[PDB]
Amino acid sequence: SNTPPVKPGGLPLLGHILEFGKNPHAFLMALRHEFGDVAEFRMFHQRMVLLTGSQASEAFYRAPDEVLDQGPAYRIMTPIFGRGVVFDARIERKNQQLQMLMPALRDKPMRTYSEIIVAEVEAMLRDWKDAGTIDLLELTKELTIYTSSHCLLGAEFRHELNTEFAGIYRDLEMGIQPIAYVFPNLPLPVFKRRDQARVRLQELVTQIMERRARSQERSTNVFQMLIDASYDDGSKLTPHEITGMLIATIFAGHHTSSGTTAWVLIELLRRPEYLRRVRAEIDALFETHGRVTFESLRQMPQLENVIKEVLRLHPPLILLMRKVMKDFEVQGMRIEAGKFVCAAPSVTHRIPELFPNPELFDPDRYTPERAEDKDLYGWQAFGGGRHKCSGNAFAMFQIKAIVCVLLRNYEFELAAAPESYRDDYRKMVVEPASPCLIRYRRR
Numbered sequence: 001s002n003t004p005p006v007k008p009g010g011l012p013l014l015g016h017i018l019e020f021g022k023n024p025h026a027f028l029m030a031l032r033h034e035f036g037d038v039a040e041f042r043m044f045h046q047r048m049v050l051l052t053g054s055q056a057s058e059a060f061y062r063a064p065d066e067v068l069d070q071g072p073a074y075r076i077m078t079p080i081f082g083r084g085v086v087f088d089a090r091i092e093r094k095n096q097q098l099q100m101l102m103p104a105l106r107d108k109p110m111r112t113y114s115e116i117i118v119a120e121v122e123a124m125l126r127d128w129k130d131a132g133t134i135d136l137l138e139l140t141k142e143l144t145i146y147t148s149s150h151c152l153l154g155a156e157f158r159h160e161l162n163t164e165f166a167g168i169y170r171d172l173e174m175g176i177q178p179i180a181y182v183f184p185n186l187p188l189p190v191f192k193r194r195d196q197a198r199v200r201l202q203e204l205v206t207q208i209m210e211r212r213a214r215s216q217e218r219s220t221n222v223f224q225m226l227i228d229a230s231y232d233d234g235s236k237l238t239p240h241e242i243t244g245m246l247i248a249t250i251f252a253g254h255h256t257s258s259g260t261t262a263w264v265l266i267e268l269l270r271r272p273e274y275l276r277r278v279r280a281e282i283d284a285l286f287e288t289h290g291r292v293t294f295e296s297l298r299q300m301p302q303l304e305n306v307i308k309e310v311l312r313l314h315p316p317l318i319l320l321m322r323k324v325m326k327d328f329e330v331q332g333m334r335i336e337a338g339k340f341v342c343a344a345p346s347v348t349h350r351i352p353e354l355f356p357n358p359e360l361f362d363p364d365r366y367t368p369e370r371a372e373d374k375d376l377y378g379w380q381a382f383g384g385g386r387h388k389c390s391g392n393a394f395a396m397f398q399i400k401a402i403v404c405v406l407l408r409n410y411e412f413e414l415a416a417a418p419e420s421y422r423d424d425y426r427k428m429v430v431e432p433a434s435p436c437l438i439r440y441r442r443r
């Protein structure tokens, strides 16, 4: 039929990659503003269709895996996780790799996690000093590594996390580059450093495994399970695969969540009217319950909603992609096989027909309004359809647990001008800007 509007101005051989890569959010916003719900642009030779608003986002999330696939779209992750891991695997092996974390997400170990997160938060706070100034993002990133390593991989893997590990995960994270969606292997300094980080991490996990074999005393874990893990065909998981799934599991638990946990604290200090309501329902469950339980955090609607609104305005994953395997239509336009197709939470969340006065921070979420369930394909920080986030329960839990432990025994103040705090829209995993300072004081 008719086909999508293609954006002009594409440089020769590079398409819009230069414009896109400077500020991906800004590019995608401008593309929707110009051409509406379905708009094509080029990343080098790759023809990309931005799908925005409810109807087009529905087509994206609801498409069968035989028409829209994640695999070719996410080659970027192959040099990070390793060959044959998640998206670089056959489906049957991918599903089995995802199924080996699912046990850590069940009701039973979740009662366990509340005490581990508090332990970890207090562990970093003991070394503090009564009043001072910290970088909120630098801390939150470090904290979510300990928090997610301990909870989902166990105390055994958490005991070895060091500075080498800290740098290794920053080098791995820096592998996520606008150019890397198209050409994930290039003779670049950012790529060599990610490759070196992975090789090094695989050497340290292999050594930790050699040791656990000699001791042979250590057992009872999710990491131990991986070490002993085989596929349903009885193939043994290698050190390479195990390393890949430890990386994937910290990307999931830590890299998604560092920014959005910083933002919750920033956004409450910016709007002290919501700080007072959140700090009320925290102290309220500090009073009624003893310490922070799991059911206590499940019944915290004020905080649940500030996180929900933080995710509408600061969705960390701003570009979800599929390769188009079979021609399909949206709003009566033929998106041809071989093209790629994109969802943009950052931009769909800012559509005024879906979120009246989009740029206003208003946590009217669990209220009669219900702007998030109004269209499961509107609000989409966690995606939608078959390949929706399968870890949202733990994600929301982890940041709740962290913030209402921080705000229960520290007073916070923005060390700079409240408007100074912005998102670095130069990254694909969007977090607050580079230097992000804050001040504290015990209660």
Ligand code: HEM
Residues within 6 Å of the ligand: 070, 098, 152, 252, 253, 254, 256, 257, 260, 315, 316, 317, 320, 321, 380, 381, 382, 383, 384, 386, 387, 388, 389, 390, 391, 392, 394, 395, 396
């Ligand atoms: C606020 C933090 C988080 C955000 C914003 C987030 C966002 C997302 C999004 C947008 C996707 C879909 C990507 C796509 O459609 O291609 C996704 C998938 C996924 N997320 Fe998360 N996530 C978060 C935290 C977590 C955590 C903590 C875990 C695990 C503990 C996790 C596990 C997963 C998994 C396994 C998938 C793949 C789903 C599948 O293909 O079956 N996420 N996440």
Ligand SMILES: CC(C)=CCC[C@@H](C)[C@H]1CC[C@@]2(C)C3=C(CC[C@]12C)[C@@]1(C)CC[C@H](O)C(C)(C)[C@@H]1CC3
Residues within 6 Å of the ligand: 074, 076, 077, 086, 097, 098, 101, 176, 245, 246, 248, 249, 251, 252, 256, 317, 318, 319, 320, 321, 428, 429
């Ligand atoms: C322990 C295991 C096997 C868990 C599986 C975790 C993965 C499915 C998650 C971890 C990080 C994750 C959320 C991510 C993404 C998808 C799902 C991932 C890979 C993607 C690739 C979505 C598209 C984004 O543009 C971007 C490239 C930033 C992210 C990176 C992190």
